[PDB]
Ligand binder design. Sequence first.
Ligand SMILES: Nc1ncnc2[nH]cnc12
Ligand SMILES: Nc1ncnc2[nH]cnc12
Ligand SMILES: [Cl-]
Ligand SMILES: [Cl-]
Ligand code: NA
Ligand code: NA
Lengths: 183, 183
Amino acid sequence: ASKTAQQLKYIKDSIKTIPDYPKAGILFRDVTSLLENPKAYSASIELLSEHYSESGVTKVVGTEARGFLFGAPVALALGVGFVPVRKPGKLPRETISESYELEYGTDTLEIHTDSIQPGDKVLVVDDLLATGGTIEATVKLIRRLGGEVVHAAFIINLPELGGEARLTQQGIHCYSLVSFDGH
Amino acid sequence: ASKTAQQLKYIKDSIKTIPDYPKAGILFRDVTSLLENPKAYSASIELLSEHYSESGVTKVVGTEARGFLFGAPVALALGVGFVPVRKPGKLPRETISESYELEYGTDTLEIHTDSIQPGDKVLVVDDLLATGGTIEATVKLIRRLGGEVVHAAFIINLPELGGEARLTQQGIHCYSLVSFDGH
Ligand SMILES: Nc1ncnc2[nH]cnc12
Ligand SMILES: Nc1ncnc2[nH]cnc12
Ligand SMILES: [Cl-]
Ligand SMILES: [Cl-]
Ligand code: NA
Ligand code: NA
């Protein structure tokens, strides 16, 4: 139908699936094929930017590193500043930190304290919503700095992994371009 | 005067300097302040993409992570695929690897074998040119797969660290928007 419905279809199709990776039974959805498809990649940025055009967002936050690939072009499209959330020890200015759980341990994300401030309306962008661990931690970073965050946006959602449910149940309206079944 | 010369000034002024980081005597050029200035960030992409508009580039490569922030918007501008180079174990499809020296040991970078083919013309994009080590590695990955690479682009050049000369001997023409003295 619309330019949006054709684009959403082309996007989903451009994302290749890798069977039995990283373990038997998992159908991996590989966003790197979308990155090397210029029509799919430009489309994705376009749709994300358009969806938030009237939202009054003042900053975009993306986590290292695939969050950078989608968050930063949306920031550039919206004409707002981009704020990276990073693995620990990479950011040079004063930071705060939050932990999150991995399958096999815990790790931390940091943000520059000078980069968010009261007033800010912040969109979080990432590639893929799975368990939502890193977004939960990002949300905390932002709120400690007085930022408002009620939107997170993704290229791919895996609803069966529960990220959406748990972010929703925490004030965050998730928007995702495409969604897949499975873990 | 030209749109170009005024933007360069602006971009150079948007980049914060942090004294004695990461240790005494170093003046750190923090590109994160440029990411959060939408005029500067947008101008930086515009200048990089305009410079290669007639280069016939078919692929843009950027190394994780700060790399992504400049290569991927350049890829999007040029309408060509973005190919990431990553630390080991992140990329899901078949890869090759190149090891390079750090101050306190060695690390490696990987690329998807499927993402570069003989006859591709590859532009490498990074934030800051210091010693040139990761770029030389990145170049070797691209050339092992048949790719042509004769251009590398940067926001910041630190000429005192020898990166540009090193790359010039590897047959790479370096373009950098701004330059800073110091190590
Ligand atoms: N199926 C899947 N594809 C890509 N990333 C994932 N992370 C968790 N499950 C995944
Ligand atoms: N002065 C400096 N600023 C930023 N990155 C660097 N890498 C090496 N020297 C640097
Ligand atoms: Cl990542
Ligand atoms: Cl980095
Ligand atoms: Na602040
Ligand atoms: Na190949």
